A paper describes a structure:
We crystallized apo [name]δ under conditions similar to those used for the [name]δ-DAG complex (but without detergent) for a direct comparison. We found the structure to be identical to the previously reported apo structure (1PTQ17) with a backbone r.m.s.d. of 0.4 Å. The apo structure superimposes well onto the structures of DAG-complexed [name]δ, with the notable exception of the Trp252 sidechain. In the DAG complex, this sidechain is oriented towards the DAG tethered to the membrane-binding region, whereas in the apo [name]δ it is oriented away from that region.
Residue numbers in the entry: 229 to 280
């Protein structure tokens, strides 16, 4: 079943669960999955398997 990634405003340093690097930026720094909690960069969403 699919991740339901929604863009997210991270308020503490949070890292990408796919590539490990910081979700850089001030706002809108990546996407969180509603259902499993996975955090990804915009550039990393295509790279993650679509299995929630
Ligand atoms: Zn998920
Ligand atoms: Zn990443």
């Amino acid at each position: 079943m699919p991740h339901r990634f929604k863009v997210y405003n991270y308020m503490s340093p949070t890292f990408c669960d796919h590539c490990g690097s910081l979700l850089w930026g001030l706002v809108k720094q990546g996407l969180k999955c509603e259902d499993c909690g996975m955090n990804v960069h915009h550039k990393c969403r295509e790279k993650v398997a679509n299995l929630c």
